[PDB]
Design a protein around this ligand. Structure first.
Ligand code: HEM
Ligand code: HEM
Lengths: 507, 507, 128
């Protein structure tokens, strides 16, 4: 009954055979119209971007190019296959309007299928492991897709794996179909038809090395087949994260752990569509270098790509060393950073996961990073109650020359801040009368900081709030039972004050 | 010294004047090369997408088109201006390599400038209000830009407004420049040169209505000027959120609150670049309808756009009512959903902000949404300790026919779950010997649920976890001082079980 | 059945915990998990006012020792037959906790106490 995703491929393709023998319905890429009937037509024709700085940083003599596939409608290189499989199912009559689509995915294919279904009205059910980011879940919820989660460490042959859960759902829900990207010929066919042609035309049919990450294997498989049919001299390089078994020879896969943070690549089984015979060489990669290279790409090239792109570039900087001047390399960047906003793009997450060290993070920082806040010139001579009127505050501020003052209640609770300029502007604009209370002008948003904190912490705070109030807490005791709390404000430090202090101490 | 952003425009442009009199250096759009030297060249040539369902839903007889500008490199329609102003500054000699760029922005222009600076090595300082999303902050941090925040309610003429803070920083930091998108002619010029030409070519020079949101005003200003020079019959429609003063006549701006959640549009002052004389009519919009229409766009058309796009479409569905069959409308979609992942894209945020009601959310849900979990068929006859070996568990599960059993410690703390199929597969694969403990196979991730909870809560939980354990807590008392806690597992419900129950009860 | 009490707790102790949370009754269970009976707030108050017990006395003198165990799967018709002989029907659950397939153990807990009053209220409310 059940059909496994690791079953050996029944394809009879081999190098040198003519395309006329292909049972498959190849689709010739065509120019889209000036007005797209639907968003799905904005898939393909992705740009090729030259990598400028990383190659020099790692001593590459060859030209390095990036196939930025994260500019598709869904933000992934898995929109191509989603559209191709849906179109093929419609053409073959397997899929009918209003049907239910079930797909086990890492999220990107699920997003593509959900978008296509929403455009075309199909019902979509997505089976996605637990480790994938919540941003994919949010996008799928917005698109109206139903989401089913499966354990991360579940074996593919288990009954509760994403593939197994999808199979169980299909046998239950009537009028349901599984496109099975792990077995559908449409997955590699889409790339073989569109992506390889785009690469060849953009490269003018000349390229020496191609590096691609491997999940289902269609992306590398189709590209390699088309290139070997057209540009036999290209070296095909595969990337498989540590903990997976796709890479060969098997000696490379000897590792103790099979759990990795990178998403969308690596599997515990060999997909049917993956033809490992066309891959010239394989490289293993780890999460740390992947995320480091992704951050470097974002910071130095402007490519808002994900972790798999980082792994691909990390492998490429090693593989291309054999190349020389005048040669060309191509790397595929699958997905965008939209799916990893709270992931590696966040420093806190990396520090928690151990991919960043305090030594590495602070070594690049300026000289003043570790200085404590107390070293600043800061003072809060006066404060006011929220009930004071605007004009009264104007008088008390102008008579002493101070431009701003905190707002504190009777009990000492800080309510926010007020500034002379804002009040003056509001009075001129008529938003408040002089008799009106300052509570309508006070800045309610502020962050508490302590004198012992460093200036780096202050800057990180200032990236989210304008005012950082230096608050100190004293606890007053009566009999070890009747404790009481007191607090007071000392200094309101902003980016202006910090930079002025830096400039003064720099001379 | 300081130059205000609201100063009246000194431009002498008027309809009918010839382009030969323009002091400005117009740039003719040109075809990009097959290989982009840098990511910045992937700006422009954005697609036009026909809106299919929303127009029918709101009874539009005319063709509705969307200028999806959220496909640029930075994901915004503010990358065009960032590149144009940087190029113009370089050409005029105002900006030199290694200089420092300061820009007061709502985040999108800051992202574009940060990307351009990272590509070209400039230092970037971004002054952004506090209300903007943290996703923009994360992206800017990744790109290496320095971020300064300002109060949301600060008046533009105040000394601590984003414009004022930028001006203060410029006078402090040497070799610093402010491009001042609120005054730079390059902002509207970029659109007048590229975006209007793209719209005309994609529309074949024929369109009757154009709807655009208004922030700095360049987007609408340049487009309207070019269209009135080329397609005078087009009606220009402006959108200004409630709480802003851009819209005219002034009667439309009478409102009590000036704080709104929508980002990137609306201001407390009239920007210099904004030419309100070319705007035929204005519409006010609110956050609720903006986010509702953004969600509808995402769900029905596949356009991953932000709130400003929602406001634009909400205004368009009203404005286009005057149109008839055979006419055409165009709406500009500024930015993507990447900047609002935790914002309206999240149901919790909308419910907290009051833009969604439980009645509205539940009215669309199925019949079984409100049923309580207890109505399911669920039982946990047995549980096992983490120390039991794999083979022992196989025997105790096979002898009774159960496929899975929870894992609980001696004290009753739930540690996770185990399944017969996973253990069998691991034994076949050799990952665990029969004598090995189940702790190497147990599923550590699960969510606790209670019998009183509804099936909708269960589904929401299942969108993040595979197993939902029905846990009940009992607290045992000795003397009102020595309390103790007890808990037990009843039912492990997954999407499979829930859908099976739904199907059974549906007949 | 959010809470339960050991038989050793005093009536005065029991009175406050019930009233501070509003529950009119709580099951009585030993340390191991053996259900001992049912005790009600109303009876404790009446007994204290009647002088049959002091607030310092243990609840074991007020506990109702007679009850019938029932399980979630059982039908209401089965419950009605039970209620013709006992006032309290305790919804118990049983789990077999295994160590090596030889050293098994049994655990149980209480989750609801249902009487003819509760059954009739459910029937009347659901009758629509
Ligand atoms: C050009 C000559 C080709 C020939 C003669 C050929 C032959 C075949 C045949 C006969 C099948 C059906 C096997 C069955 O139904 O049991 C098949 C399926 C398939 N083809 Fe090809 N093929 C060709 C090209 C390609 C190319 C270019 C690709 C990918 C880029 C491809 C990928 C696949 C895959 C993945 C399957 C599914 C195999 C399975 O499900 O077991 N084939 N092929
Ligand atoms: C086609 C004939 C045009 C003429 C004769 C003209 C004239 C001028 C002149 C003389 C200035 C400099 C004013 C000064 O330095 O004080 C100026 C600036 C400016 N131009 Fe134009 N312009 C033309 C077209 C345009 C167009 C098409 C746009 C926008 C799409 C535009 C937008 C601006 C803006 C925003 C300024 C800045 C004004 C200020 O900073 O006060 N102009 N224009």
């Amino acid at each position: 009954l059940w059909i496994r995703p690791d079953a050996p491929s029944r394809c009879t393709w081999q190098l040198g055979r003519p395309a006329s023998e292909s049972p498959h319905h190849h689709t010739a890429p065509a120019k889209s119209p000036k007005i797209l009937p639907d968003i799905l037509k904005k898939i393909g024709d992705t740009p090729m971007v030259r990598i400028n700085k990383i190659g020099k940083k790692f001593g590459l003599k060859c030209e390095l190019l990036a196939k930025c596939e994260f500019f598709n409608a869904g933000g992934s290189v898995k929109d191509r296959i989603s559209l191709r499989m849906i179109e093929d199912a419609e053409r073959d009559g397997t899929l009918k309007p209003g049907d239910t689509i079930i797909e086990p995915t890492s999220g990107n294919t699920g997003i593509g299928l959900a978008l296509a279904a929403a455009v075309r009205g199909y019902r979509c059910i997505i089976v996605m492991p637990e480790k994938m980011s919540s941003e994919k879940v949010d996008v799928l919820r917005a698109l109206g897709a139903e989401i089913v989660r499966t354990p991360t460490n579940a074996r593919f042959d288990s009954p509760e794996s994403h593939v197994g859960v999808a199979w169980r759902l299909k046998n239950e829900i009537p009028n349901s179909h599984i496109l099975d990207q792990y077995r559908n010929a449409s997955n590699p066919l889409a790339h073989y038809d569109t992506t390889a042609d785009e690469i060849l035309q953009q490269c003018d049919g000349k390229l020496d090395m191609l590096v691609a990450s491997v999940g289902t294997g269609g992306t590398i498989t189709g590209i390699a087949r088309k290139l070997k049919e057209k540009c036999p001299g290209c070296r095909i390089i595969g990337v498989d994260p540590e903990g997976s078994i796709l890479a060969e020879p098997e000696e490379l896969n000897q590792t103790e752990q099979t759990t990795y943070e990178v998403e969308g690549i690596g599997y515990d089984f060999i997909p049917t569509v993956l033809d490992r015979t066309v891959v010239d060489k394989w490289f293993k990669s780890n999460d740390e270098e992947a995320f480091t290279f992704a951050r470097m790409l974002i910071a130095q090239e402007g490519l808002l790509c994900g972790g798999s792109a980082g792994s691909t570039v990390a492998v490429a900087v090693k593989a291309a060393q054999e190349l020389q001047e005048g040669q060309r390399c191509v790397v595929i960047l699958p997905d965008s950073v939209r799916n990893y906003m709270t992931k590696f793009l966040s420093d806190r997450w990396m520090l928690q996961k151990g991919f960043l060290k305090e030594e590495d993070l602070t070594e690049k920082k300026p000289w003043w990073w570790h200085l404590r806040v107390q070293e600043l010139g800061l003072s809060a001579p006066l404060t006011v109650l929220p009930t004071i009127t605007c004009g009264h505050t104007i008088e008390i501020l102008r008579e002493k020359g101070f431009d701003q003052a905190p707002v504190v209640d009777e009990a000492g609770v800080i309510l926010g801040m007020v500034t002379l300029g804002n009040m003056l502007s509001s009075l001129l604009a008529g938003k408040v009368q002089p008799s009106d209370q300052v509570g309508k002008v006070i800045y309610k948003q502020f962050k508490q900081i302590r004198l012992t904190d460093t200036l780096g912490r202050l800057s990180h705070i200032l990236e989210m709030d304008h005012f950082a109030l230096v608050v100190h807490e004293q606890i007053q005791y009566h009999s070890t039972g009747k404790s009481s709390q007191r607090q007071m404000v000392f200094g309101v430090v902003t980016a202006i004050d910090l930079l002025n202090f830096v400039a003064a101490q720099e001379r």
